[PDB]
Amino acid sequence: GPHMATGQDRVVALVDMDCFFVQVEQRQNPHLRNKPCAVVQYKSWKGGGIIAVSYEARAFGVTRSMWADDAKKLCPDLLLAQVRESRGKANLTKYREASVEVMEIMSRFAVIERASIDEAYVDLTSAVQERLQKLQGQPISADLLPSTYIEGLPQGQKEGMRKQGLFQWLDSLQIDNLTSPDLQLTVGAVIVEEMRAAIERETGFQCSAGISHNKVLAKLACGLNKPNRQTLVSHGSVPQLFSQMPIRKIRSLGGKLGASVIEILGIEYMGELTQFTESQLQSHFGEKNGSWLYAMCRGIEHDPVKPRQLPKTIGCSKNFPGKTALATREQVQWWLLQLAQELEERLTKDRNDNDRVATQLVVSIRVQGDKRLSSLRRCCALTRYDAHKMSHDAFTVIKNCNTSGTEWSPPLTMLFLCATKFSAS
DNA sequence: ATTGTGACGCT
DNA sequence: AGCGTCAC
Ligand SMILES: Nc1ncnc2c1ncn2[C@H]1C[C@H](O)[C@@H](COP(=O)(O)OP(=O)(O)OP(=O)(O)O)O1
Numbered sequence: 071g072p073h074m075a076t077g078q079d080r081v082v083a084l085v086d087m088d089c090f091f092v093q094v095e096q097r098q099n100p101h102l103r104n105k106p107c108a109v110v111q112y113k114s115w116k117g118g119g120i121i122a123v124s125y126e127a128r129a130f131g132v133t134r135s136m137w138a139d140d141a142k143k144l145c146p147d148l149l150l151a152q153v154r155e156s157r158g159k160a161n162l163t164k165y166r167e168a169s170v171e172v173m174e175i176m177s178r179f180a181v182i183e184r185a186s187i188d189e190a191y192v193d194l195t196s197a198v199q200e201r202l203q204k205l206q207g208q209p210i211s212a213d214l215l216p217s218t219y220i221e222g223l224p225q226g227q228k229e230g231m232r233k234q235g236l237f238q239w240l241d242s243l244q245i246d247n248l249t250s251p252d253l254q255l256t257v258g259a260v261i262v263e264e265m266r267a268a269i270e271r272e273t274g275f276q277c278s279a280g281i282s283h284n285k286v287l288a289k290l291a292c293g294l295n296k297p298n299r300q301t302l303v304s305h306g307s308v309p310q311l312f313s314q315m316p317i318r319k320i321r322s323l324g325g326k327l328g329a330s331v332i333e334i335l336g337i338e339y340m341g342e343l344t345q346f347t348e349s350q351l352q353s354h355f356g357e358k359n360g361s362w363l364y365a366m367c368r369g370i371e372h373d374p375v376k377p378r379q380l381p382k383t384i385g386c387s388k389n390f391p392g393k394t395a396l397a398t399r400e401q402v403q404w405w406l407l408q409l410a411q412e413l414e415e416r417l418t419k420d421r422n423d424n425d426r427v428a429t430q431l432v433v434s435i436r437v438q439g440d441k442r443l444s445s446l447r448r449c450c451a452l453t454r455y456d457a458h459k460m461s462h463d464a465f466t467v468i469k470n471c472n473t474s475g476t477e478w479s480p481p482l483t484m485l486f487l488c489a490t491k492f493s494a495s
Numbered sequence: 496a497t498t499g500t501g502a503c504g505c506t
Numbered sequence: 507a508g509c510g511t512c513a514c
């Protein structure tokens with residue numbers, strides 16, 4: 071009743087750049103704009119692996135993780151942009167720098183949590199209070215929400231429907247109550263329209279967004295209407311939305327835990343979780359997961375938007391599949407050196423930009439014929455930004471995996487160097 | 496022969 | 507610390 075808190079205390083947004091690597095390449099090369107086009111890494115094995123897909127190309131069935139030769143079978147006019155290769159490996163610097171452009175603009179409006187290269191959460195609670203008291207009571211015009219969908223409306227042409235739903239929502243709004251969560255979400259959506267407009271004006275990049283009361287709902291909302299649109303998921307919309315929502319669509323339930331929720335409880339949709347007690351869920355999935363599930367099937371989640379605009383780790387990884395697996399000492403050293411040289415470049419730039427130094431080096435490998443993505447992960451001290459030293463140290467830390475009696479056995483199918491444990495500098 | 500990331504939990 | 511999960 072009155073004492074049942076409803077998870078309506080915050081306004082949270084999730085902003086995701088539409089097919090981001092594709093947009094970066096389309097800005098750089100206007101011949102690629104408004105076309106079926108994809109970004110690919112490498113080119114020799116089956117045309118390269120596709121890692122990003124424009125919405126025009128998705129309409130033909132082109133997806134990430136597809137070989138370019140196969141995507142061309144589905145879409146013969148598919149245009150391709152290749153990731154840069156440096157020191158023998160893909161180098162994602164152009165996309166990291168484009169991401170910083172976008173994150174820096176987002177940070178003008180509110181505090182952000184960089185979730186990935188192309189996604190950030192936004193804590194809009196204080197921004198909305200400021201904008202509300204600036205309003206001083208006047209209603210919110212549909213004109214301020216030109217690309218917003220209100221999930222679940224209308225009830226009782228796509229753009230026509232969008233506007234019908236938005237009118238129904240705005241007519242219902244009690245503007246005089248500055249504490250109404252629905253009003254707070256709406257003002258959040260206004261600010262996110264402004265944020266997205268600034269991003270597109272100042273970078274050329276388009277993005278979609280979700281606006282709700284917590285991170286999981288905002289991310290779910292963001293997926294509902296892409297590309298170049300934003301979706302408001304109100305607390306009231308959760309029962310109908312979750313009633314037919316596959317459990318795997320909720321963030322963190324797309325993997326083995328989600329599968330076990332489905333298998334153990336014999337359900338399919340998020341809303342079905344409401345039938346279980348908190349203790350029942352904890353008994354199946356542990357104290358933390360159980361409490362989290364109990365609240366989240368009711369629309370409630372308390373994970374904070376962390377004030378963190380920069381990555382916590384700086385990593386350099388390469389897979390060596392098939393007959394390209396590394397089999398000699400010289401080979402393992404030369405690739406460790408290539409990785410360490412890219413890492414040194416990125417670390418020196420990071421220290422200059424962001425006033426910090428990494429203090430720990432993580433070295434991870436995969437051996438041929440191991441079924442894990444990671445076979446071993448050991449750390450050592452990272453004391454200076456020297457590629458020769460970092461590569462010698464990573465070797466020193468992995469060398470006792472060689473079981474040869476100049477040769478390397480078993481052959482290595484992945485190398486990975488990660489700088490971690492930053493401290494202010 | 497999805498790759499190259501990057502965040503977080505468990506013990 | 508080292509390993510595992512999750513989401514791209
Ligand atoms: N599995 C992956 N491997 C490599 N790069 C990836 C992978 N997933 C995503 N990326 C990169 C390329 C994408 O442009 C960028 C953002 O990923 P993501 O947001 O899932 O898709 P997207 O931005 O390409 O399209 P969407 O419009 O659906 O968001 O990160």
Ligand SMILES: [Mg+2]
Binds near residue numbers: 088
């Ligand atoms: Mg995206």
Ligand SMILES: [Mg+2]
Binds near residue numbers: 086087186188189
């Ligand atoms: Mg994303």
